[PDB]
Design a protein around this motif. Structure first.
Motif, PDB file in Angstrom:
ATOM      1  N   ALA A   1       0.849  -1.211   0.000  1.00 42.27           N
ATOM      2  CA  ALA A   1       0.000   0.000   0.000  1.00 42.27           C
ATOM      3  C   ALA A   1       0.876   1.250   0.000  1.00 42.27           C
ATOM      4  CB  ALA A   1      -0.910   0.016   1.178  1.00 42.27           C
ATOM      5  N   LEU A   2       0.553   2.190  -0.882  1.00 41.40           N
ATOM      6  CA  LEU A   2       1.267   3.448  -0.915  1.00 41.40           C
ATOM      7  C   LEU A   2       1.227   4.176   0.434  1.00 41.40           C
ATOM      8  CD1 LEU A   2       0.608   4.913  -4.543  1.00 41.40           C
ATOM      9  CD2 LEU A   2       2.694   3.845  -3.521  1.00 41.40           C
ATOM     10  N   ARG A   3       0.038   4.315   1.025  1.00 46.08           N
ATOM     11  CA  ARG A   3      -0.108   5.016   2.310  1.00 46.08           C
ATOM     12  C   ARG A   3       0.331   4.053   3.416  1.00 46.08           C
ATOM     13  N   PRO A   4       1.344   4.420   4.214  1.00 42.94           N
ATOM     14  CA  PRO A   4       1.819   3.560   5.319  1.00 42.94           C
ATOM     15  C   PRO A   4       0.707   2.960   6.210  1.00 42.94           C
ATOM     16  CG  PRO A   4       3.227   5.511   5.106  1.00 42.94           C
ATOM     17  CD  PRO A   4       2.096   5.688   4.130  1.00 42.94           C
ATOM     18  N   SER A   5      -0.242   3.807   6.632  1.00 39.18           N
ATOM     19  CA  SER A   5      -1.290   3.409   7.580  1.00 39.18           C
ATOM     20  C   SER A   5      -2.210   2.337   7.030  1.00 39.18           C
ATOM     21  CB  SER A   5      -2.140   4.609   8.012  1.00 39.18           C
ATOM     22  OG  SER A   5      -2.641   5.342   6.901  1.00 39.18           O
ATOM     23  N   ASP A   6      -2.251   2.214   5.706  1.00 38.55           N
ATOM     24  CA  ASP A   6      -3.039   1.169   5.037  1.00 38.55           C
ATOM     25  C   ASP A   6      -2.318  -0.180   4.978  1.00 38.55           C
ATOM     26  OD1 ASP A   6      -5.153   2.937   4.428  1.00 38.55           O
ATOM     27  OD2 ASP A   6      -4.446   3.273   2.359  1.00 38.55           O
ATOM     28  N   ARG A   7      -1.025  -0.223   5.342  1.00 37.92           N
ATOM     29  CA  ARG A   7      -0.303  -1.507   5.285  1.00 37.92           C
ATOM     30  C   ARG A   7      -0.733  -2.345   6.471  1.00 37.92           C
ATOM     31  NH1 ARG A   7       5.158   1.685   4.098  1.00 37.92           N
ATOM     32  NH2 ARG A   7       4.287   2.714   2.241  1.00 37.92           N
ATOM     33  N   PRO A   8      -0.605  -3.667   6.348  1.00 39.72           N
ATOM     34  CA  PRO A   8      -0.971  -4.522   7.452  1.00 39.72           C
ATOM     35  C   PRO A   8       0.050  -4.490   8.546  1.00 39.72           C
ATOM     36  CG  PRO A   8      -0.062  -5.869   5.681  1.00 39.72           C
ATOM     37  CD  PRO A   8      -0.083  -4.430   5.194  1.00 39.72           C
ATOM     38  N   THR A   9      -0.414  -4.816   9.756  1.00 42.34           N
ATOM     39  CA  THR A   9       0.464  -5.053  10.890  1.00 42.34           C
ATOM     40  C   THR A   9       1.013  -6.456  10.702  1.00 42.34           C
ATOM     41  OG1 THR A   9      -1.234  -6.138  12.245  1.00 42.34           O
ATOM     42  CG2 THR A   9      -1.110  -3.736  12.398  1.00 42.34           C
ATOM     43  N   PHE A  10       2.001  -6.823  11.510  1.00 45.58           N
ATOM     44  CA  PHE A  10       2.526  -8.181  11.450  1.00 45.58           C
ATOM     45  C   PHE A  10       1.478  -9.244  11.751  1.00 45.58           C
ATOM     46  CE2 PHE A  10       7.284  -7.088  12.453  1.00 45.58           C
ATOM     47  CZ  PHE A  10       7.407  -6.433  11.266  1.00 45.58           C
ATOM     48  N   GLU A  11       0.671  -9.027  12.778  1.00 48.23           N
ATOM     49  CA  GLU A  11      -0.449  -9.915  13.065  1.00 48.23           C
ATOM     50  C   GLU A  11      -1.393 -10.085  11.882  1.00 48.23           C
ATOM     51  OE1 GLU A  11      -2.973  -8.415  16.173  1.00 48.23           O
ATOM     52  OE2 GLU A  11      -4.055 -10.284  16.491  1.00 48.23           O
ATOM     53  N   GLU A  12      -1.762  -8.987  11.242  1.00 45.33           N
ATOM     54  CA  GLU A  12      -2.604  -9.058  10.038  1.00 45.33           C
ATOM     55  C   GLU A  12      -1.957  -9.858   8.888  1.00 45.33           C
ATOM     56  OE1 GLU A  12      -3.446  -4.729   9.873  1.00 45.33           O
ATOM     57  OE2 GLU A  12      -5.567  -5.272   9.900  1.00 45.33           O
ATOM     58  N   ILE A  13      -0.650  -9.707   8.706  1.00 46.41           N
ATOM     59  CA  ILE A  13       0.073 -10.548   7.729  1.00 46.41           C
ATOM     60  C   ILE A  13      -0.028 -12.013   8.129  1.00 46.41           C
ATOM     61  CG2 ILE A  13       2.303 -11.161   6.768  1.00 46.41           C
ATOM     62  CD1 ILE A  13       2.991  -8.158   7.010  1.00 46.41           C
ATOM     63  N   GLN A  14       0.215 -12.321   9.392  1.00 46.34           N
ATOM     64  CA  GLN A  14       0.202 -13.730   9.792  1.00 46.34           C
ATOM     65  C   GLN A  14      -1.184 -14.333   9.901  1.00 46.34           C
ATOM     66  OE1 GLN A  14       3.264 -13.348  13.050  1.00 46.34           O
ATOM     67  NE2 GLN A  14       4.117 -15.073  11.901  1.00 46.34           N
ATOM     68  N   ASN A  15      -2.212 -13.505  10.022  1.00 43.40           N
ATOM     69  CA  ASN A  15      -3.571 -14.032   9.996  1.00 43.40           C
ATOM     70  C   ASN A  15      -4.162 -14.093   8.586  1.00 43.40           C
ATOM     71  OD1 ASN A  15      -3.951 -14.573  12.790  1.00 43.40           O
ATOM     72  ND2 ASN A  15      -4.537 -12.439  13.178  1.00 43.40           N
ATOM     73  N   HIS A  16      -3.451 -13.548   7.585  1.00 49.40           N
ATOM     74  CA  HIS A  16      -3.963 -13.499   6.213  1.00 49.40           C
ATOM     75  C   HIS A  16      -4.214 -14.932   5.707  1.00 49.40           C
ATOM     76  CE1 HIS A  16      -4.117 -12.663   1.841  1.00 49.40           C
ATOM     77  NE2 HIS A  16      -4.368 -11.402   2.160  1.00 49.40           N
TER      78      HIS A  16
END
Ligand SMILES: O=C(O)c1cc2cc3ccc4oc(C(=O)O)cc4c3cc2o1
Lengths: 7, 267
Positions: free
Chosen positions: B234-249
């Motif tokens: 994501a271009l906007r930093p705040s729209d990127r996932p957290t680490f938890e969100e990556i691992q729950n994907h």
């Protein structure tokens, strides 16, 4: 085409 | 105390080594004081390169980070004694030689890179140079190890305005504005790395592509994986996932254990 990129 | 073999690795100097005391495989890394820009002080307050400071903070307990076994100061340099797995290949050579990785294999790798960066963050360390070249694969155990904290910093929650890592893995906020936050920049770099794994090379080379926000897939990549990559990029930093969100994907579910990965893909 594929290459390393130094720091 | 150490028997010095031949160079392993550019402009850097890391030698094969074996600790005489027990024949442990070691890597012996030499760093010139003339070329050290960032300095710190240890738990006891001796003035050392930051790289040493950060390696010490991450090097206790077991993890997916190469561990610092000891270090010595010399007149014009510091020497660092590090773990050396065997047999080993860095992830860049491995992708060059084998091409785009199968998703099952990319998933095991990426997951392990996530655990290793979580571990760094938890210990107060931002690596700032996550890339295939800074990841070693232990081909028997199927375990990845992060290397080279020479561009790293203490993790903080405020903005960073300096950066000496790899430009093609740096986020658009760094390119455009010369500022970034740690974690969100880390996540961007992990999206580059993931693309690199599933496509066989990184997606961007030029500034304009980095800031451009367009991800073209040159290989067949499942759509759950494309979505994770695009989220991380994501271009906007705040729209990127957290680490938890990556691992729950959903793309991240049912990860292979390391042995399984070694048996299925590396042996
Ligand atoms: O067979 C090989 O190529 C091989 C084995 C091997 C082990 C290493 C262990 C720690 C390291 O830290 C760095 C660093 O730059 O921090 C590089 C390395 C390093 C490079 C290596 O290359």
């Amino acid at each position: 085409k594929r290459r390393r990129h130094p720091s | 105390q150490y028997q010095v073999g031949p160079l392993l690795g550019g402009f850097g100097s890391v030698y094969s080594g074996i600790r005489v005391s027990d024949n442990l495989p070691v890597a012996i890394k030499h760093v010139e004081k003339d070329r050290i820009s960032d300095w710190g002080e240890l738990p006891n307050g001796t003035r050392v390169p930051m790289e040493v400071v950060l390696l010490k903070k991450v090097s206790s307990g077991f993890s997916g980070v190469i561990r610092l076994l000891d270090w010595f100061e010399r007149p014009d340099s510091f020497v660092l004694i590090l773990e050396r797995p065997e047999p080993v290949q860095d992830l860049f050579d491995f992708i060059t030689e084998r091409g785009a990785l199968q998703e099952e294999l990319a998933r095991s790798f990426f997951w392990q890179v996530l655990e290793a960066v979580r571990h760094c963050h938890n210990c107060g360390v931002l690596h700032r140079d996550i890339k295939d070249e800074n990841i070693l694969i232990d081909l028997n155990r199927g375990e990845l190890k992060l290397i080279d904290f020479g561009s790293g910093a203490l993790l903080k929650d405020t903005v960073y305005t300096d950066f000496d890592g790899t430009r093609v893995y740096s986020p658009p906020e760094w390119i455009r504005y010369h500022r970034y936050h740690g974690r969100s920049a880390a996540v961007w770099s992990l999206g580059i790395l993931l693309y690199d794994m599933v496509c066989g090379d990184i997606p961007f080379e030029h500034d304009e592509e980095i800031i451009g926000g367009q991800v073209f897939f040159r290989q067949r990549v499942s759509s759950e994986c494309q979505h994770l990559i695009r989220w991380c990029l994501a271009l906007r930093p705040s729209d990127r996932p957290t680490f938890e969100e990556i691992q729950n994907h959903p793309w991240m579910q049912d990860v292979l254990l390391p042995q399984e990965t070694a048996e299925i893909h590396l042996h």
